[PDB]
Paper text:
HDACs form 2 major families: Zn++-dependent HDACs and NAD+-dependent HDACs, also termed sirtuins (SIRTs). SIRT2 has deacylation activities in addition to deacetylation, including demyristoylation, and several SIRT2 inhibitors are acyl group selective, blocking deacetylation but not demyristoylation. The structures consist of 2 domains: an upper Zn++-binding domain and a lower catalytic domain with a Rossmann fold. The 2 domains behave as a clamshell, accommodating varying acyl-Lys modifications within a flexible pocket between the 2 clamshell domains.
We produced crystals of FLS-359 bound to SIRT2 that diffracted to 1.8 Å resolution and determined the structure of the complex. FLS-359 bound SIRT2 between its Zn++-binding domain and the catalytic Rossmann fold domain, in the EC pocket where other small-molecule ligands have been localized. The binding interactions of FLS-359 with SIRT2 include π-π interactions with residues F119, F190, and Y139. Water residue 566 bridges FLS-359 and SIRT2 with one hydrogen bond to the thiazole of FLS-359 and another hydrogen bond to the backbone carbonyl of residue F96. A multi-body water network in the peptide channel connects, via a hydrogen bond network, the dimethyl imidazole of FLS-359 to E116 through water residue 371 and to the side chain of R97 through water residues 371, 165, and 652. These water-mediated hydrogen bonds could be key interactions that drive binding affinity to SIRT2 in the hydrophobic EC site. NAD+ binding is not predicted to be affected by FLS-359 binding. In contrast, the FLS-359 dimethylimidazole moiety resides in the same location as the peptidic acetyl group, but computational superpositioning predicts that the pocket can accommodate both FLS-359 and the peptide. Modeling predicts that SIRT2 can accommodate both an acetyl group and FLS-359, whereas the binding of a myristoyl group excludes FLS-359. In sum, enzyme thermal denaturation and kinetics studies, as well as co-crystal structure determination, argue that FLS-359 binds selectively to SIRT2 and induces an allosteric rearrangement of the active site, reducing the rate of deacetylation.
Numbering used by the authors:
A (entry chain B): 56 to 98, 102 to 356
B (entry chain A): 56 to 98, 102 to 299, 305 to 355
Write the structure that this text describes.
């Protein structure tokens, strides 16, 4: 017998306010930051790198190429460095989940730091594709850590960032091609996916790793709500880690029992869910107060 | 245990010609059909999907959507239907493996039928992502089978293919999102990987199931040759899901050959003494295809 009374946003809200739902995991991608003006750094932003004649377009995000020729990456980083950092209604919805004791973890494939600006703490977060929040000297014997303020000053001054201690390259803690996913992802995912009562999957197409396969690590009974412009994750039998196990999203089949798709902008979906839960005024008041503070320090 | 004398194409060829190597498994993907003009149906084909008013781009390959609205799929099938079916050097290299009693199985993730055109038979093949070669009525109680010539005529005439028995939808035997991997795959994979002496992995980045799994099903002693345009796990960690070891101090059984699958197979054919047979086979088969 399935846990949701019906496969609708209304059924998820009732489940969230039941004793059965204590621990929520959020999986978030580029779709939660587009309303904050953060480009989807995956899906034409290369068309001002003429002077660099890259050997292939993706070389700019490949660790071995970066370490030999870091200048293209830092030129692009200046061009695309966000003009302001104003988290969205969706980011503040996750802050409410934390305040209400429901947030087990926010897994993010975003690098923009908006989860932290919205008030999620390191312990609440798994930055599965890394983050601009910190940067490190690349020299194995040194690994000196630098804050974003330091990296920003290097980016805007068009000075290739070098370590103060050893003068090696300093790289933002974002995952390049040819690097591993962060240690923190592997640690947290083996424990969190045992304890999860609800997966809230927002603003991700579920095409890139780890989220494309990670959805299949949830217990088969755990309800999953996708808030996104379109249905995503119906990828079986191609992307599940276990052959013959059907862990991909199923909104549409005869056997659908636990997956709900709410189609629209992540902000409007989060407002809709907040409204059902009786949290709409709290969420709007939170966004008003936080946005007002960000504008004031402008 | 090290079955290769050396981690080179020359060491693999010597091993293949030795009594120890009787049973070769090929894992082949989109990289073996690109030189034949077959698009990689996975990896800008999302651009002209706009015109179908799909609820999400992948709906065109999803079984529940297909059964309700088959017209977009069959319209794209007309657009992307190959203009010619000329198997590659790599396809004909696997035909030589069959003829010379070395081929245990060709596992393909390709749907283009070029393995069959090259002369691999059903018994030689596991079409792990299915195939356009046959189509079936989708009604559980009917399942009338249709050949590609029948499906092609429906696709080009822009007539939704309907069963001549029951008028249900007729679907190509390709794996849509929402379907199982083929019965044939589950049967063969549990037996073949006990008997395999050599894995020949060609034109696949091992990014999706079942190849992501199959790569590690061989005995730990079984040598593995990768012939591929790009290094194993190039787009790691964003598109990859044991794993192959060409280069570490512990490397003992994995060989990489980086380049076009055709050029890799010609190189290996050279060391086997099969190059003239292979070129003559391609010439004679392509000549016959052009004549018809
Ligand atoms: C399947 C696949 C994966 N990838 C892939 C892999 C690695 C990376 C990318 C994409 C894209 N990357 C970037 N893009 C633009 C960048 C400039 C930038 C972004 C943010 C900030 N920022 C400062 C403070 C807050 N945010 C400043 C500058 S960094 C990060 C590496 C591709 C291309 N396809
Ligand atoms: C992880 C993942 C999986 N997938 C995925 C899943 C299912 C399918 C696809 C891709 C691609 N599909 C297709 N592509 C083009 C097609 C037109 C076409 C192709 C061949 C011929 N042909 C006639 C004779 C010989 N070949 C005629 C028309 S059918 C088949 C279903 C994605 C997108 N990501
Ligand atoms: Zn240093
Ligand atoms: Zn029928």
């Amino acid at each position: 017998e399935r846990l949701l009374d019906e496969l609708t946003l209304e059924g998820v809200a009732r489940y969230m306010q039941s004793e059965r739902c204590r621990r929520v995991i959020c999986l978030v991608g580029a779709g939660i930051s587009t309303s904050a003006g953060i480009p989807d750094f995956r899906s034409g932003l290369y068309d001002n790198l003429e002077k660099y004649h890259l050997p292939y377009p993706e070389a700019i995000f490949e660790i071995s190429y970066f370490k030999k020729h870091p200048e293209p990456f830092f030129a692009l980083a200046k061009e695309l460095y966000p003009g302001q950092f104003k988290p969205t209604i969706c980011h503040y919805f996750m802050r409410l989940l934390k305040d209400k004791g429901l947030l087990l973890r926010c897994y993010t494939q975003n690098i923009d730091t908006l989860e932290r600006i919205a008030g999620l703490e390191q312990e609440d977060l798994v930055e599965a594709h890394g983050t601009f929040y910190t940067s490190h000297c690349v020299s194995a014997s040194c690994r000196h850590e630098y804050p974003l303020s330091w990296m920003k000053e290097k980016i805007f001054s068009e000075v290739t960032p070098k370590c103060e201690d050893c003068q090696s390259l300093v790289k933002p803690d974002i995952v390049f091609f040819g690097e591993s996913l962060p240690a923190r992802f592997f640690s947290c995912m083996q424990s969190d996916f045992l304890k999860v009562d609800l997966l809230l999957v927002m603003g991700t197409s579920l095409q890139v790793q780890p989220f494309a396969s990670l959805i299949s690590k949830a217990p088969l009974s755990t309800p999953r709500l996708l808030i996104n412009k379109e249905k995503a994750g119906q990828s079986d039998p191609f992307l599940g880690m276990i052959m013959g196990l059907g862990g991909g999203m199923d909104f549409d089949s005869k056997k659908a029992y636990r997956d709900v798709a709410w189609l629209g902008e992540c902000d409007q979906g989060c407002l809709a869910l907040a409204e059902l839960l009786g949290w709409k005024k709290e969420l709007e008041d939170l966004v008003r107060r936080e946005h007002a503070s960000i504008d004031a320090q402008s």
